[PDB]
Design an enzyme around this catalytic site. Structure first.
Site, PDB file in Angstrom:
ATOM      1  N   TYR A   7      11.553   6.439  -5.211  1.00  0.00           N
ATOM      2  CA  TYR A   7      11.652   4.463  -5.087  1.00  0.00           C
ATOM      3  C   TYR A   7      10.417   4.499  -4.503  1.00  0.00           C
ATOM      4  O   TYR A   7      10.251   3.209  -4.284  1.00  0.00           O
ATOM      5  CB  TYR A   7      12.423   5.465  -3.646  1.00  0.00           C
ATOM      6  CG  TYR A   7      12.157   6.300  -2.646  1.00  0.00           C
ATOM      7  CD1 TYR A   7      12.504   7.532  -3.317  1.00  0.00           C
ATOM      8  CD2 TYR A   7      11.238   5.830  -1.824  1.00  0.00           C
ATOM      9  CE1 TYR A   7      12.060   8.499  -1.680  1.00  0.00           C
ATOM     10  CE2 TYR A   7      10.739   7.115  -0.406  1.00  0.00           C
ATOM     11  CZ  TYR A   7      11.236   8.033  -0.821  1.00  0.00           C
ATOM     12  OH  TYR A   7      11.014   9.016  -0.300  1.00  0.00           O
ATOM     13  N   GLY A   8       9.263   5.514  -4.322  1.00  0.00           N
ATOM     14  CA  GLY A   8       7.370   4.843  -4.168  1.00  0.00           C
ATOM     15  C   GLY A   8       6.172   5.229  -4.997  1.00  0.00           C
ATOM     16  O   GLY A   8       6.467   4.718  -5.514  1.00  0.00           O
ATOM     17  N   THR A   9       5.788   5.989  -4.103  1.00  0.00           N
ATOM     18  CA  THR A   9       4.757   6.805  -4.149  1.00  0.00           C
ATOM     19  C   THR A   9       4.206   7.271  -5.644  1.00  0.00           C
ATOM     20  O   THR A   9       3.536   7.409  -6.587  1.00  0.00           O
ATOM     21  CB  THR A   9       3.714   7.900  -3.623  1.00  0.00           C
ATOM     22  OG1 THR A   9       4.530   7.957  -2.562  1.00  0.00           O
ATOM     23  CG2 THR A   9       3.102   8.542  -3.942  1.00  0.00           C
ATOM     24  N   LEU A  10       5.423   7.559  -6.236  1.00  0.00           N
ATOM     25  CA  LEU A  10       5.127   7.530  -7.850  1.00  0.00           C
ATOM     26  C   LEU A  10       6.140   7.274  -8.380  1.00  0.00           C
ATOM     27  O   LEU A  10       5.485   7.243 -10.375  1.00  0.00           O
ATOM     28  CB  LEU A  10       6.305   8.886  -7.731  1.00  0.00           C
ATOM     29  CG  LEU A  10       6.246  10.104  -7.346  1.00  0.00           C
ATOM     30  CD1 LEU A  10       6.932  11.520  -7.391  1.00  0.00           C
ATOM     31  CD2 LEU A  10       5.518  11.372  -8.103  1.00  0.00           C
ATOM     32  N   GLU A  70       0.448  18.387  -1.715  1.00  0.00           N
ATOM     33  CA  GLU A  70       0.548  18.788  -0.354  1.00  0.00           C
ATOM     34  C   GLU A  70       1.483  17.399   0.355  1.00  0.00           C
ATOM     35  O   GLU A  70       2.239  17.884   1.397  1.00  0.00           O
ATOM     36  CB  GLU A  70      -1.122  18.178   0.289  1.00  0.00           C
ATOM     37  CG  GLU A  70      -1.263  19.305   1.713  1.00  0.00           C
ATOM     38  CD  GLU A  70      -0.736  19.883   1.250  1.00  0.00           C
ATOM     39  OE1 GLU A  70      -0.832  21.275   2.223  1.00  0.00           O
ATOM     40  OE2 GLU A  70      -0.811  21.328   0.057  1.00  0.00           O
TER      41      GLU A  70
END
EC number: 2.3.2.-
Length: 118
Positions: A7-10, A70
């Site tokens: 849903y976000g960063t990826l 990380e």
């Protein structure tokens, strides 16, 4: 092969999408029971609402690499239902931070960019 719902960063065009360059895009879907917040990072937490996700099929090596990043420190792996079958999703493991994205779609932030520059 692991099925994931991001849903976000990826998501495509987002900061860590390069990790999925070899993955197979199945399509987008909506996950019920989740809210989306955003400060410096996007956060999906359980709550009233629906969350927009992109569903992918990734191999074992790719999944392990992502789950080692990380930045994944504060998120924990959960399972969610999608129209393509069960998938893993990285749920924020603490109180969410930042403003709520009412549409449940991380692209709402791009709409803001549009409003300011176009």
């Amino acid at each position: 092969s692991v099925r994931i719902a991001v849903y976000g960063t990826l998501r495509k065009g987002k900061p860590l999408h390069w990790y999925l360059k070899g993955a197979k895009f199945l399509g987008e879907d909506w996950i019920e029971g989740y809210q989306l917040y955003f400060e410096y990072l996007p956060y999906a937490v359980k709550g009233k609402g629906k969350l927009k996700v992109e569903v992918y099929e990734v191999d074992k090596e790719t999944f392990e690499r992502i789950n080692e990043i990380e930045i994944g420190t504060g998120y924990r792996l959960v399972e969610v239902s999608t129209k393509f079958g069960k998938a893993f999703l990285w749920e924020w493991g603490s109180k969410p931070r930042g403003k709520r994205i009412k549409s449940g779609d991380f692209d709402e932030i791009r709409l803001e960019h549009h409003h300011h520059h176009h």
